[PDB]
Amino acid sequence: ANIVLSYGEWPEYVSVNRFYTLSTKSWKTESTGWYWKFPDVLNDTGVFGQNAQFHYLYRSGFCMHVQCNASKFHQGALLVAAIPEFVVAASSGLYPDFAHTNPGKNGQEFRDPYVLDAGIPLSQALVFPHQWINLRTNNCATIIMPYVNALPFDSALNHSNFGLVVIPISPLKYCNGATTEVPITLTIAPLNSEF
Amino acid sequence: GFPTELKPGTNQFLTTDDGTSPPILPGFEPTPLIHIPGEFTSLLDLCQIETILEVNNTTSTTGVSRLLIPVRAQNNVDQLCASFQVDPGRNGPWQSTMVGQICRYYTQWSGSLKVTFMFTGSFMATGKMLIAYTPPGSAQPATREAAMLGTHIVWDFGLQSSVTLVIPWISNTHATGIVTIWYQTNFVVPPDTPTEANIIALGAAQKNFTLKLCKDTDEIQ
Amino acid sequence: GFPTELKPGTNQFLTTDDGTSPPILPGFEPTPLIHIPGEFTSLLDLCQ
Amino acid sequence: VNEASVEHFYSRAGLVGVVEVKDSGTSLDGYTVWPIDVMGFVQQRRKLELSTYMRFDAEFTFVSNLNDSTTPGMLLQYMYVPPGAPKPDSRKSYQWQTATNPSVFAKLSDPPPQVSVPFMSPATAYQWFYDGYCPNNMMGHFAIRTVSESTTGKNVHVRVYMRIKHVRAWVPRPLRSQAYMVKNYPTYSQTITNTATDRASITTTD
Amino acid sequence: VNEASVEHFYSRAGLVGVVEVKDSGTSLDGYTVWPIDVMGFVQQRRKLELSTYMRFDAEFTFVSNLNDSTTPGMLLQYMYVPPGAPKPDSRKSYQWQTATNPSVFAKLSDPPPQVSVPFMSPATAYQWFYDGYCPNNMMGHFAIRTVSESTTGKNVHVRVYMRIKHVRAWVPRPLRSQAYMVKNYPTYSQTITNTATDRASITTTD
Amino acid sequence: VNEASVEHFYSRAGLVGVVEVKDSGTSLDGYTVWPIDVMGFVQQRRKLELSTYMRFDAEFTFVSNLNDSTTPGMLLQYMYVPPGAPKPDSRKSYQWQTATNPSVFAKLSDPPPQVSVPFMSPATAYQWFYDGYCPNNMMGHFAIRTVSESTTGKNVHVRVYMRIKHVRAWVPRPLRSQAYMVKNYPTYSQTITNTATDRASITTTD
């Protein structure tokens, strides 16, 4: 399909290289968005969680796919973005708690989508390797992501390389009789991993 | 050689100057460089990325709702829907895009632009629309029968999902164009389907674009 | 040549600098060198 | 064009801070320290945060003067301490004489001193945003002393200018629309302000 | 010959204006601005209006002195602002520290400062006469400040000299016989004066 | 690497001693002598005693100042006497005018004087330890005089910096763990101190 390769370069260096299907999220008329830190989303699941928590050093690339499941009588549009070094700020104790900074595999719901919860206009969050989802055109999106870092071979339990963000620009709406929540599904597949 | 005489300009410090200074830590060696994937060298190529434009800048609208254009069905066939100017550097709709925030660090610019529209409605919705551009130094059209004469493009969102237009050439400094959206045909809908939709503006620049003078910006934080 | 203008950094003394200084005893000659057996040149090889 | 370059975008000198050593009145001391930074002003913050990773060199210039634009011939000392080293704590402490803290000597009536400093970092680039878990990118300090035995009674005002060379930026990010509140942290106020000016209607113009 | 050239006709230095910054008496301020011009004197006007279109570069020299030909060692600052930019409005305003307004620092007892400025115009040449529908050919300004905290009480007198290089003139026109009245406009008086001296008769001579 | 070298280990400038010539109060004299050394400070002693035989050259710099960081224009004289020669003994003795004691003249308000001295030794290298049977390695002296007829009443403070070039070290030896007590002799105190910090047990750690 219409796969996008971030920055045009692949990472380029059985049991721990397989598809991991995450929890499904429900989309409603009122909704802000969700995000996931990506060096940790899998730090509690499968073999990958075990060898990441044991070994000191880590490096890897990733491939992500987002799927929708709606009908021809629904309407909406989403945006999927990947942000290297996504730091989350706190509005006015100058210290966000652990939950927002390091959410589990289920992610955290956005509080203020307009400023991207970091004072970022969100009208410019397209320089990042993004993609669009329109409920009348298609229902899929794929993204490749190499291993960006300043110092090679960093930690996996004390660092966050990047984050993935999904935001509804246009609001969901429908007519009477239709299901009141389209589901969304996310999958991951580690590629060229090292320890 | 030895017979030298000094000349005016001696012992002055000029901020906009480059020369030679001795190192303070001779023999030190820095960390070797490696290959970080992304790299931007030219500042001008950041204006080619298409960002979203804010045309709903009207009081009593806040949040993320200031980014969409509402289109209805009960509206008549011949009337205006929306309009905005072209000036990137000036205040207004072009303040929420990377072209109109990087043109505040310079004074003179010239070239062509690019605007892309996108429709987000139900699959079984059909209709037509009209988009026009009035050249610089004229009057805004009052009827669609007058906007039909100049430069325009028809759009049927029931058969296409996105359309694009290109401005020929603009050049401002420090009266500059206008674009309008008109209705042509109403909005048709089958039973048990919503009667609302939205549009996105998606402004951007072109390959012929130059900046000619450096100055500090004014929109502080 | 003759048309020269001085630049910032003049008349300063930097400790971590090397340059040229005139000799104070011109014409003097030192004792010739001979071969003392042991010789360490690199400081890093004392850790082995 | 050449003017629309990363090389020319960051290639200028400019003030980064003012330092005054006071030896009169209620305060009678001869030394003053200053932690070197690159993001002490808002405008340079918004221009340096268009990227995430950077690597460059720095050149520093010192202009010093009395309180009435007069330039007598008293001597002064400028010393730079690398990161991970004790800093002076008195007018005539022991640290003022060490062979590894590069120091320079100049008079008050002379062309301004000018020095250069290499790229000091244990990584391959500087980071303004760090998602992992008093400037963050430590570079050093500058201790300024007037060489004298007893007090002098005259205050000195010092400004400093920095030029950066051989810039390299890698990944971009959008600019900032919210007001700055705290240093080293992106915390923002609770009254979100719209990025664009307002208009009476979507079908009106001037 | 070489002496009867356009190149040698305009190639000389000369005064263009005098500026005094006053910090004593009823006026206690530290700054003064001056709009740069090329036609502030009558003689240079009549020599620059032999043509209509011109293109050149400029070099500026500054000589500064007290009121009794004395040269102490107080510091001074010269700043140039390009067209289309705010100008300072106070002794210690914010505009005195900007990285894009090229400024220079020099002392009062030193060889005179000397700087050069390129050809600044949005057209292909300057125009002294414009038939279409506060100098007309805007080029910039010069703000001069004495770096001090409080007042000084001493006035400063400054002169400025300009040299022009690489001249190019295109279309000529006759000279001026009427007296100048207003700047930027060719308005002339109502008493027309004859261009030639008078004579008793057409058949007489000395 | 280049940084872990004998060449870079010893290649730095640094203070070796301070000298003050006093001509006020109970002491009214114009001259002061200083026996040049290389091991007047503890840190340089422990760094120069990692070897036994060495050979190098030396460069000396002089910084001089009043007691209030002021630099008037009085004249001064610096003279170096080679080993095996009488030294001055009065403000205006005969030894101040000899053609074989290299002397230099400089003012108090000028860039610091800088001179170089060759490798002065009757052997092929210097020895810090001599098993056979007032520095040991005699090199010379420095006499400093203010050229004047009568007294002046103003004291002068002088510091001196030394750089060494073309180093050569031959045989190494371990460092020092005991406190220094006397110069030119390795005598140590009677309370032997352990080289390593203490621990509660051989099976405990933090």
Numbering used by the authors:
A (entry chain B): 98 to 110, 127 to 205, 214 to 316
B (entry chain C): 1 to 174, 188 to 234
C (entry chain C): 1 to 48
D (entry chain A), E (entry chain A), F (entry chain A): 70 to 202, 219 to 291
Structure paper excerpt:
CVA6 and EV-A71 are both viruses of the Enterovirus genus. P1 harbors the structural proteins that form the capsids, while P2 and P3 encompass the non-structural proteins responsible for the processing and replication of the viral RNA. An example of such a platform is the baculovirus expression vector system (BEVS), requiring only the expression the P1 polyprotein and 3CD protein to produce enterovirus VLPs. Second, native virions have the viral capsid protein VP0 cleaved into VP2 and VP4, whereas VLPs (generally) have VP0 intact.
Single-particle analysis with 44,582 particles yielded an icosahedral CVA6 VLP capsid structure at 3.15 Å overall resolution. The structure of the CVA6 VLP revealed typical surface features associated with enteroviruses, such as the prominent star-shaped plateau (mesa) at the 5-fold-symmetry axes, a narrow canyon-like depression surrounding the mesa, and an open channel situated at the 2-fold axes. Furthermore, the cryo-EM reconstruction revealed that the independent precursors of the particles (protomers) consisting of the three viral proteins (VP0,VP1, and VP3) were highly similar to the previously reported structure. The structure of our CVA6 VLP matched well with those of the CVA6 procapsid (RMSD between 189 pruned atom pairs: 0.729 Å; across all 207 pairs: 1.181 Å) and the previously reported CVA6 VLP (RMSD between 196 pruned atom pairs: 0.917 Å; across all 221 pairs: 1.354 Å). Despite these minor differences between the previously published CVA6 VLP structure and ours, both structures indicated an absence of the pocket factor. The second indication hereof, also deduced from the cryo-EM structure, was the absence of the characteristic VP0 cleavage into VP2 and VP4. With a sequence coverage of >80%, our MS data unequivocally revealed the presence of this concatenated VP0 protein and indicated extremely low concentrations of VP4 and VP2. Our 3D reconstruction and associated radial intensity averages reveal weak, but unstructured, density signal in the particle interior. While previous enterovirus VLP reconstructions did not detect the presence of RNA (center is masked out in the CVA6 structure), we consider the presence of RNA to be the most plausible explanation for this observed increased density, whereby this RNA could change conformation or orientation within the VLP particle. The observed differences in critical force and critical indentation indicate that CVA6 VLPs can withstand less force and deformation prior to structural failure than their virion counterparts.
